[PDB]
Write an enzyme that holds these catalytic residues in place. Sequence first.
Site, PDB file in Angstrom:
ATOM      1  CG  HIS B 108      -1.826   1.061   1.410  1.00  0.00           C
ATOM      2  ND1 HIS B 108      -2.912   1.283   0.443  1.00  0.00           N
ATOM      3  CD2 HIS B 108      -2.058   2.298   2.166  1.00  0.00           C
ATOM      4  CE1 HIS B 108      -3.612   2.288   0.561  1.00  0.00           C
ATOM      5  NE2 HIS B 108      -3.099   2.825   1.541  1.00  0.00           N
ATOM      6  CB  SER B 135       2.636   0.081   4.614  1.00  0.00           C
ATOM      7  OG  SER B 135       2.882   1.319   5.331  1.00  0.00           O
TER       8      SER B 135
END
Lengths: 209, 209
Positions: B108, B135
Site C-alpha cells: 500500500h 507499507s
Amino acid sequence: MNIVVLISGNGSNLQAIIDACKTNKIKGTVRAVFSNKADAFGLERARQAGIATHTLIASAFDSREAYDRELIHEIDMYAPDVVVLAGFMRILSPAFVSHYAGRLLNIHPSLLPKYPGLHTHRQALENGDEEHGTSVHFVTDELDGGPVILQAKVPVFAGDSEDDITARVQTQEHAIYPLVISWFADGRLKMHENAAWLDGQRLPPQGYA
Amino acid sequence: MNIVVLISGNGSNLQAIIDACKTNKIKGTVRAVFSNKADAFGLERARQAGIATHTLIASAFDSREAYDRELIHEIDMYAPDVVVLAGFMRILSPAFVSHYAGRLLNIHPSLLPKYPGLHTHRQALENGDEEHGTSVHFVTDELDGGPVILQAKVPVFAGDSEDDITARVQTQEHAIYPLVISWFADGRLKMHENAAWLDGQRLPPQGYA
Ligand SMILES: Nc1nc2ccc(C[C@H](C(=O)O)c3ccc(C(=O)N[C@@H](CCC(=O)O)C(=O)O)cc3)cc2c(=O)[nH]1
Ligand SMILES: Nc1nc2ccc(C[C@H](C(=O)O)c3ccc(C(=O)N[C@@H](CCC(=O)O)C(=O)O)cc3)cc2c(=O)[nH]1
Ligand SMILES: NCC(=O)N[C@@H]1O[C@H](COP(=O)([O-])[O-])[C@@H](O)[C@H]1O
Ligand SMILES: NCC(=O)N[C@@H]1O[C@H](COP(=O)([O-])[O-])[C@@H](O)[C@H]1O
C-alpha cells in the site's frame, strides 16, 4: 513525583507500589487511590498508609462520559505525574485516555496480545498454553492494545489449578509493576509514535527483552 | 518457489520483483501475472520476460464472487507459494483472501494505518505531512488492514509535488517489496494470530523496526 492509582478490588499490586515508594525504589509517592467499588480492600490499604481515597459509583452518573469527567476532575486535584491502573475493572473513555496520554499505565494479567479482556487465567488454562504471564503497558483506547512495556512469563505445568498459576503470576506482577513505574519516575520511560521507549530505545511488541 | 503477481497498471513493482528473481535475491520465480485491465503495461513486462499472462475483465462476470472464483481457478494452475498484489486496483472477496490466507501480500502506497485506500499521496501533501511512505503487508479482508510487514518512510519538503513524492515513494517500493518477498521465500516470514512474524519474532504494528 505524584502517582494516582485506580483500583476495583484487593489491591495487592497497589500495595507493592506503595511499598516501593516507601523503600524509594520508586522515587515518588502514591498521592491517592480511586475505586469504582466501595468495597475494594485496596482503599483500606491506602487508608492505613495515610493515603487519600475516593470512590466513584457508576450508578451516580448517567453516562460513561459524565463519569470519567468527574474522574478526571477528581484525579487532577492531586496533580499526578502518572495514573496507574491496578485491577481497575472499568473501561475508560477516549477523552480520559487522551487526557493522560503517555502517562497512563496498566498491568494486564496475560501475555499480550494474547487474551485481551477479562478472564485471562481461565483461557490460558483451557486452551492448554504451556506458558502464562502478565503485561504492563501504556494505555490507549484499544482494550489492552497499547504499547507493552514489560512482561513476566510464568511456566504452566499439569496439575496447576487456575488459582495456582494466578498466585504465580501475581508474584511477578508485584515485581515488574513497581519497576516499570520507577522507570517512568526517572524519566527513562516514555511513549511516542504510539510506541514504548526505554532509555531512548524502542521496545519490541512484547516489551523490554 | 512459485510467485503469481496481480496487477492493474504499469507494473514497476512487478518489474522490481522480476529483476530480483533474475538476480536470485528472491530464490523463486514469477510464474504468472494476472490483470483486471487488458491495457496494463505490466502484462507486456511479463510477456517480454517469457512469463505467462492472463486478463480477467469484471464485465465478463455477474458478481464479485464469480469473478474471484475464476481468478482462484486460474491462479492455481501455477501452484503459487505466494500471491503478490502489485498495483491491483480491485478489492478481493473474503473467499479469495481465505484461500490464500498467510500467503497473500500487498504493498500500500502510504504509511499505514494512515490513509487506507486510494489517493494516498494527495492526502499526504494536503494534510501537510512531513513524512510519507509505503507499507507492505499481509492481506486480510480489511482493506489495507492486514499485518504490516515493512514500511519505507520518505521525507516531504516544501517544494515537493505530488509527482515528486510519488516517484520518491516508488523508488522505496522497488526496494522493500522484493525484500519482503525474499523473506517469505526463505520461510522467514509468516502470519498467524493475525500478526506478522520475521525470523520467529512478532513485528510491531508498523512493521519491522
Ligand atoms: N481505554 C482503555 N481503558 C481501559 C480501562 C481499564 C483497563 C483494565 C483491564 C485490563 O487491562 O485487563 C480491563 C478492565 C475491565 C474491562 C471490561 O470490559 N469491564 C466491564 C465492561 C464495561 C466497563 O464497565 O468498563 C465488565 O464488567 O465486563 C476490560 C479490561 C484497560 C483499559 C485499556 O486498555 N484502554
Ligand atoms: N480483501 C482485500 N482485498 C484487497 C485487494 C486489493 C488491495 C490493494 C489496494 C491498496 O492497498 O491500495 C486497493 C485495491 C482496490 C481499492 C478499491 O477501492 N477499488 C475499487 C472498489 C471495488 C472494486 O474493486 O470494484 C474502486 O474503483 O474504488 C482500494 C485499494 C488490498 C486488499 C485488502 O487489504 N483486502
Ligand atoms: N482491570 C485490570 C486487571 O486486569 N487487573 C488484574 O486483576 C488482578 C487484581 O490484582 P490486585 O490485587 O492488584 O487488585 C491483577 O492480577 C491484575 O492484573
Ligand atoms: N491498489 C494497490 C495500490 O495502491 N498500489 C500502488 O500503486 C502503484 C502501482 O505501481 P506499479 O504498477 O508501477 O507497480 C504502486 O505505487 C503501488 O503501491
